[PDB]
């Protein structure tokens, strides 16, 4: 499906339907400040096409939303290319949220998780975040219903050791947390435990095929997951390969070429040669 740009949804649900035909959000997704929404507004609402967000996901003050299991059932990767103060996932002051329910979330490349001040929030102790983030050291999961000890969490599920005890791994009463053998690393596996291709990230429709990945570990090009963009293509938004012409079209209303990447701006020590979008180093101090 489509690549949609970063979104910022506030006040009304109307604008949320802009996500309807979408596979990747190239940017962040913020859903916030919905004070008059009620559970009935979310009973019939789903975006099953969404597989990946390149930056971060932020949910703040969205009233009436009880679970995300119907909203983002297939969200598999949050890349964390840009973060919200070190976080790739932010659940803050989500009054009414009873569970996360992101049962397809396999990997958070880059950042950490901040789930704070969610009265009603359970199904947190049941999640093994070490399967999703390399660093759980910087997670900040506090002041939720889960803190009190009396979340009647009820889950078959692959219990793992977090403290000194094995604890069940599930997202909701009807969804276990997927765990792949350690040998699969982050590539994901099939229901039968067979590793996905090494260029996949999190999940695949078939094993050992880089055109059958749910998401890419490295970069995406012409239906396929690739280790690097080959010439003449450029690395874009740290997830896809684009041609010069694409980067140029962006620039012309402000993107530049540097080290085989199409990037927002020239890095320090460089200025932009105008005729070919190319960052060239500075003869003496840089323009200012």
């Amino acid at each position: 499906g489509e690549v949609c740009p970063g979104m910022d949804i506030r006040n009304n649900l109307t604008r949320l339907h802009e996500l309807e035909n979408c596979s990747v959000i190239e940017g962040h997704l913020q859903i916030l400040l919905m004070f008059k929404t009620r559970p009935e507004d979310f009973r019939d609402l789903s975006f099953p096409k969404l597989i990946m967000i390149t930056d971060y996901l932020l949910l703040f003050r969205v009233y009436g939303l009880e679970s995300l299991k119907d909203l983002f059932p297939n969200l598999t990767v949050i890349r964390g290319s840009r973060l919200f103060f070190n976080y790739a996932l932010v659940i803050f002051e989500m009054v009414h949220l009873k569970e996360l329910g992101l049962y397809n979330l396999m990997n958070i490349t880059r950042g950490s998780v901040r789930i704070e001040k969610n009265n009603e929030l359970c199904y947190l102790a049941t999640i093994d975040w070490s399967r999703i983030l390399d660093s759980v050291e910087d997670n900040h999961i506090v002041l939720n219903k889960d803190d009190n000890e009396e979340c009647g969490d009820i889950c078959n599920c692959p219990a793992t050791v977090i403290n000194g005890q094995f604890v069940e791994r599930c997202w909701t009463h009807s969804h276990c947390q997927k765990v792949c053998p350690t040998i699969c690393k982050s590539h994901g596996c099939t229901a039968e435990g067979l590793c996905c291709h090494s260029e996949c990230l999190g999940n695949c429709s078939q094993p050992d095929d880089p055109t059958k990945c749910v998401a890419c570990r490295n970069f995406y090009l012409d239906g396929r997951c690739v280790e690097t963009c080959p010439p003449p293509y450029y690395h874009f938004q740290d997830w896809r390969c684009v041609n010069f012409s694409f980067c140029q079209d962006l620039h012309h209303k402000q993107y530049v070429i540097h080290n085989n990447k199409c990037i927002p701006e020239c890095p320090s020590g460089y200025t932009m040669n105008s005729s070919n979008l190319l960052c060239t180093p500075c003869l003496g101090p840089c323009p200012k």
Partner: antibody
Amino acid sequence: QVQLKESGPGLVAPSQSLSITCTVSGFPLTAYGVNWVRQPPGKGLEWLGMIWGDGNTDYNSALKSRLSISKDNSKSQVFLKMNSLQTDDTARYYCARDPYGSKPMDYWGQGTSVTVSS
Amino acid sequence: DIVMSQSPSSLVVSVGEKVTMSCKSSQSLLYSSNQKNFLAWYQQKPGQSPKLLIYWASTRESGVPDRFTGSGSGTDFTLTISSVKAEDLAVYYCQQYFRYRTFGGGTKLEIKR
């Protein structure tokens, strides 16, 4: 189950064109490139050109762009056409897959022998 | 257009010995964005189709004996066979896939007995 096979004419009269169809299976031409390489009897390999997933092509300038590479994604076929062959174009012609951003030419066809003579 | 040149054109070695052959490119094949060399080595046993052995100048293809080792960076490259076996007899080629794709002239390996 990656496979590639060339269907050539075997013989080409001097000044005539060479047409070869490479039929592939086990992968989609939309996600992989296909190259053509030739080997004169008892000599080395010469890279001729390739067709990327998007249909864009790269040709070896030594061929004096006598070469055309096209394809039909739905029929898993890649077409080589070369204008006005001469005796020195006598060689075994191979179509080889290349998984561009990840690997170099993985999976070669058995090749088809081409003789230019009357 | 990148030009590739290999040496020796040929050599002979007996079973068990180590062998090294070189490849040269008129332009650097070292990709900025990842610090990888866009060079490959192919082995062609006589009468057979060529086989990919090494890519990225040093990455060994799966199902390739540890005997084959690729070295070099930028414009100068080498292929090494760490204990030649009877069936290692073949022509070795290097290919650049940085800009377009071009093959070297190849090196022929014969076996002494």
